Amino acid sequence: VKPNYALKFTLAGHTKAVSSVKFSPNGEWLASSSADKLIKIWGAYDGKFEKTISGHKLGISDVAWSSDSNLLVSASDDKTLKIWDVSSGKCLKTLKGHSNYVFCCNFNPQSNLIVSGSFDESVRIWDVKTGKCLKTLPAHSDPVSAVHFNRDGSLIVSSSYDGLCRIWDTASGQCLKTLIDDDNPPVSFVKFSPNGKYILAATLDNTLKLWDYSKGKCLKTYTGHKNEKYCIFANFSVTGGKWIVSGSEDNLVYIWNLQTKEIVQKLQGHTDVVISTACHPTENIIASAALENDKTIKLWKS
Ligand SMILES: COc1cccc(C(=O)N(Cc2cccc(-c3cn4c(n3)CCC4)c2)CC2CC2)c1
């Protein structure tokens, strides 16, 4: 069984490389962030431009939705995160604390906390309501590429150019596990599986790996794409077949069968590295976004 994703919409508006795209949990919206310092909101189903959210002083590298689809958090080279009320467009809080560029961010499932990762090689945990830092984890010895909460929010997984994946106790801040394979390439992305059993990790040796967190073992490897230079998002696609989805530095979107690890589709159309992809929560829809030579977001439907 193979999907037949087909291009439906191309979304133009950002004036520099796109950084990160995410679908709202309620499925209505796509948020994008960009090196152009802007957040843009788009209709998830029609690709129709909705509004621009502005305020960061420098480029934004990541953006993420609150559980109720009402808030965004963004991570920027201005060394802040910003919490946004999407309807009003207002910046509710500016999170100051990192000493270098903030590269990655996420809400916990309860959306009372935010986790962030930075070039200052730390991971910080923030209180959403007060906008204050609760914990600072001396997490890595190189820039942090990704941070993600597990299903009940009790765990944080982080990745770094230092070659490590680490799992942290949210409440205590203690390192619970360090994961690394036979080699030490930079780890450029990590996230928990939807059921929370697994960890999907990208390394800059053109490889994605599915880990059993609790066993601390690599279960699956996904190859065939190009990933040696940039931190490319990866996803679990679950609305139809169970796929792994990733951008690639050959300007394609790759889709693998999660179980068999075979490539089942490649999406062609971007003119630069596909840095970010996202999967719609209820429809077979993928959003993809590319770097400076391209500047567009594309919406594919299977
Ligand atoms: C983290 O340390 C590094 C070092 C060198 C390159 C990059 C990088 O991926 N990009 C591309 C890029 C741009 C914007 C956003 C992202 C990005 C953010 N996140 C991810 N990629 C995965 C999780 C969070 C990457 C840098 C761009 C070309 C100048 C990252």
Side-chain angles (χ1 to χ4, degrees), residues 105-118:
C105 58
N106 263 317
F107 283 90
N108 69 343
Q110 260 177 1
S111 295
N112 61 309
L113 297 180
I114 286 165
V115 64
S116 64
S118 167

Side-chain angles (χ1 to χ4, degrees), residues 17-20 22 33-35 60-63 103-105 118-119 143-147 159 161 188-190 204 229-234 249 275-276 291:
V18 192
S19 302
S20 182
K22 305 290 184 59
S33 60
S34 169
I60 304 168
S61 298
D62 204 6
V63 68
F103 189 71
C104 51
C105 58
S118 167
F119 279 79
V144 183
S145 52
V147 285
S159 57
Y161 272 67
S188 50
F189 183 74
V190 72
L204 293 189
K229 290 198 165 188
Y230 301 101
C231 290
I232 304 188
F233 290 84
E249 297 167 356
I275 196 72
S276 174
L291 296 182

